[PDB]
C-alpha cells in the first residue's frame, strides 16, 4: 500500500556533505525518523519528528521533510558515518513502514594490508579423529581476498570452506578460511599453508605437525 523508497547506495568524499532521500506520496504529511545501522548491530535512531536529533547524535546530522521527499543530510561527512541508513514513518493504514535503506560509503579509504593468522589442528581435534586448519584474515581493504591452500607446495582444492569478507567495526574487512583434514593427511605431509592474496601482495603463513 504505502511504501517509502530510498536509493540503495551513496558515496561522498570525506568532510564534504552527504544527502539521503526517502520518497513516498504525501510523505511531508507524516513524521520521518532516520535510523543508522552498522554491520551486525541493531539500528540506532539519529533523527525523529522530521528534524529532531536525540541526545548523543553529533550536530552534523540533520533531516528535512517536504511534500514528497524526506532528506537526511550529513554535513562534515566522516569515516565512522559509513553505514546503512533507514527512513521510517507511521501510516494509518499500514502503520510502521520503513524505506529500503541506503548504504553510505565515504570515498577514498587507503589500501589496507591483511593480517593472516593460521592455526593448526588442536590436540583435542586430532584426538577426535578430525582435523581443521584455521586461516584467519583481519583488517584489509578493499574487501577482496583470494585464499588458497597448499599441501607440501601442492594445491588443495577439496575440504576448503571460506567466507565472503565482511565489514569490520573499523571499516576494514575480515574473512576466515577453514581446511578439513583426516588426521592421516595432516600427519602425513611435511606442512600445509594457506596463502592470502590481497591486491597483488600475497601473505603465506605455513604450519606443520609435531
Amino acid at each position: 500500500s504505502y511504501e517509502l523508497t530510498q536509493p540503495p547506495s551513496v558515496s561522498v568524499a570525506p568532510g564534504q556533505t552527504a544527502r539521503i532521500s526517502c520518497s513516498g506520496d504525501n510523505i511531508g504529511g507524516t513524521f520521518v525518523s532516520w535510523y543508522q545501522q552498522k554491520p551486525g548491530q541493531a539500528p540506532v535512531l539519529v533523527i525523529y519528528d522530521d528534524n529532531d536529533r536525540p541526545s548523543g547524535i553529533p550536530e552534523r546530522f540533520s533531516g528535512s521533510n517536504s511534500g514528497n521527499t524526506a532528506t537526511l543530510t550529513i554535513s562534515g561527512t566522516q569515516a565512522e558515518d559509513e553505514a546503512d541508513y533507514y527512513c521510517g514513518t507511521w501510516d494509518m493504514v499500514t502503520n510502521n513502514v520503513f524505506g529500503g535503506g541506503t548504504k553510505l560509503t565515504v570515498l577514498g579509504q587507503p589500501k589496507a594490508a591483511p593480517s593472516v593468522t593460521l592455526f593448526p589442528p588442536s590436540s583435542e581435534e586430532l584426538q577426535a579423529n578430525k582435523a581443521t586448519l584455521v586461516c584467519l584474515i583481519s583488517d584489509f581493504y578493499p574487501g577482496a581476498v583470494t585464499v588458497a591452500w597448499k599441501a607440501d607446495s601442492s594445491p588443495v582444492k577439496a575440504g576448503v570452506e571460506t567466507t565472503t569478507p565482511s565489514k569490520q567495526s573499523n571499516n576494514k574487512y575480515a574473512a576466515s578460511s577453514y581446511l578439513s583434514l583426516t588426521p592421516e593427511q595432516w600427519k602425513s605431509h611435511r606442512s600445509y599453508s594457506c596463502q592470502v592474496t590481497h591486491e597483488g601482495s600475497t601473505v603465506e603463513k605455513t604450519v606443520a605437525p609435531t
Partner: protein, 106 residues
C-alpha cells in the same frame, strides 16, 4: 539527481541485453529475485554470479562488480534467499533495470 557515469553505463547495458536478446536470456537459467533494498548491487551480483553457461550476462556481472565493495564468490551455499523467489534471468535483468531507472524519476 544527475547520473553517476559508471551507473548509466550499467543502465545502458542492462537495456541492451533486455531489448536486444533474441531467444531467452541464458536459456532457462533461473536466479534469485531482489528488492530495492541495501546490498542490492551485491545481491544482484551474487544472484547472477551463479549462472555459468551464459556469456550475455558477463559484462553486466563485471559492471555490477565495481558497485559491490566486497568480493562475491559463486556458490556461497546459504539460506539467505529466505525472502526472495526464483525467477527467469530475463525478468531478473528487467526488474533491476526498472529499479535503477526509477532512481532517476523525479
Amino acid at each position: 539527481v544527475p547520473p553517476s557515469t559508471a551507473l548509466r553505463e550499467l543502465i545502458e547495458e542492462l537495456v541492451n541485453i533486455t531489448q536486444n536478446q533474441k531467444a531467452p536470456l541464458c536459456n532457462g537459467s533461473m536466479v534469485w529475485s531482489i528488492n530495492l533494498t541495501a546490498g542490492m548491487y551485491c545481491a544482484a551480483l551474487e544472484s547472477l554470479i551463479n549462472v555459468s553457461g551464459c556469456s550475455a550476462i558477463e559484462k553486466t556481472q563485471r559492471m555490477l562488480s565495481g558497485f559491490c565493495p566486497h568480493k562475491v564468490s559463486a556458490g556461497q551455499f546459504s539460506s539467505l534467499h529466505v525472502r526472495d523467489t526464483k525467477i527467469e534471468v530475463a525478468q531478473f535483468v528487467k526488474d533491476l533495470l526498472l529499479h535503477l531507472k526509477k532512481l532517476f524519476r523525479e
